[PDB]
From a paper:
In the present study we report the crystal structure of the N-terminal DNA binding domain of the [name] restriction endonuclease ([name]-N), which recognizes the modified cytosine in the sequence context 5′-C(mC)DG-3′ (where D – A/T/G), and provide mutational/loop-swapping analysis that supports the structural model for the sequence recognition. SRA-like domains were recently identified in prokaryotes, where they serve as modules for the modified cytosine recognition by the modification-dependent restriction enzymes that protect host cells from infection by bacteriophages containing methylated, hydroxymethylated or glucosylated DNA. The modified cytosine base is extruded outside the DNA helix and accommodated in a pocket of SRA and SRA-like proteins. In summary, we show here that [name] recognizes the context of the flipped cytosine via several surface loops that act as separate DNA binding/recognition modules.
Here, we report the apo-structure of the DNA recognition domain of the cytosine modification-dependent [name] ([name]-N). The structure of [name]-N was solved at 2.1 Å resolution. The asymmetric unit contains two almost identical protein molecules (RMSD < 0.5 Å over 209 Cα atoms), with slightly larger deviations observed only at the N-termini and two flexible loops (residues 24–26 and 51–54). The largest contact surface (∼750 Å2) is formed between the N- and C-termini of both A and B subunits that encircle the 160–170 β-hairpins of the symmetry related A/B subunits. This ‘pinching’ interaction, however, is not functionally important, since [name]-N is a monomer in solution. The overall structure of [name]-N is very similar to that of the SRA-like DNA binding domain of AspBHI (RMSD 1 Å over 170 CA atoms). This allowed us to solve the [name]-N structure by molecular replacement using the AspBHI-N structure as an initial model. [name]-N is more compact than the corresponding domain of MspJI (224 versus 260 aa). The loops connecting β3–β4, β7–β8 strands and E–F helices are shorter in [name]-N by up to 5 aa; nevertheless [name], like AspBHI, contains an 8 aa insertion in the β8 strand that breaks it into two parts.
Author numbering: -2 to 224
């Protein structure tokens, strides 16, 4: 059994983001143990949906899932470079778009931008995907799954963002099922990450993202399994 690179908690602040590398969380027991907010300054330390930047139009979005709940089956298909992600309305209470972190409202904006006939993809920021990946030293450890963009080649706008119904204790409510493409980006450099708020100081790490922004045609991370 072989392992990808594993970053200890005290090495996170200047780490690169590497496909399927593991980033260990803290041991203090408290909130600051969150590995994601240590890796990326500007990103909060809690939530399935996180963003950086002030304004309606963010600089970066992070999607985080624990992959533990069968009711909301988030998944990655490594052979297709496809990520299926459920939105932030997981309980009865408010309308699908009425959520504290505004994940669902933002998902709607991002997919509508992606499929818009005018200014297509204009407001879409880079999206980073992390999944919970417990290690011995920490249960808050995560794994980077890649840079992602809304939609998937061959999927219609009807299919890549669906309001699905669920029932909880007899109460019916809606939540988004969103489908993303994982880009062929093996690494996001520390230089890029430190230069999140300024494209001038960025390197070429996200060139496939900027290409997608221009054309709407993604260079997909296609990774067939070994037997």
């Amino acid at each position: 059994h072989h392992h990808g690179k594993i970053y200890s908690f005290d090495t996170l602040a200047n780490a690169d983001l590497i496909i399927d590398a593991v980033y260990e969380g803290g041991s203090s027991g408290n909130a600051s143990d969150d590995p994601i907010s240590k890796i990326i300054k500007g990103i909060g330390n809690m939530g399935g949906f996180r963003s950086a930047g002030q304004g309606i139009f963010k600089k970066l979005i992070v999607l985080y899932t624990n992959m533990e709940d069968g009711d909301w089956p988030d998944s990655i298909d490594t052979s297709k470079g496809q990520f299926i992600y459920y939105g932030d309305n997981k309980h009865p209470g408010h309308d699908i778009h009425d959520t504290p972190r505004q994940g669902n409202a933002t998902l709607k904006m991002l997919f509508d931008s992606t499929h818009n006939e005018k200014d297509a993809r204009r407001i879409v920021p880079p999206i980073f995907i992390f999944v919970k990946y417990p290690t011995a030293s920490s249960s808050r450890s995560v794994q980077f799954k890649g840079v992602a963009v809304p939609g998937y080649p061959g999927l219609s706008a009807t299919d890549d963002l669906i309001a699905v119904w669920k029932t909880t204790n007899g109460q019916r409510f809606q939540n988004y099922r969103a489908i993303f493409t994982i880009l062929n980006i093996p690494m996001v450099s520390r230089k890029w990450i430190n230069s999140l708020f300024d494209p001038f100081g960025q390197d070429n790490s996200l060139n496939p993202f900027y290409q997608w922004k221009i054309s709407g045609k993604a260079d997909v991370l296609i990774a067939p399994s070994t037997k």
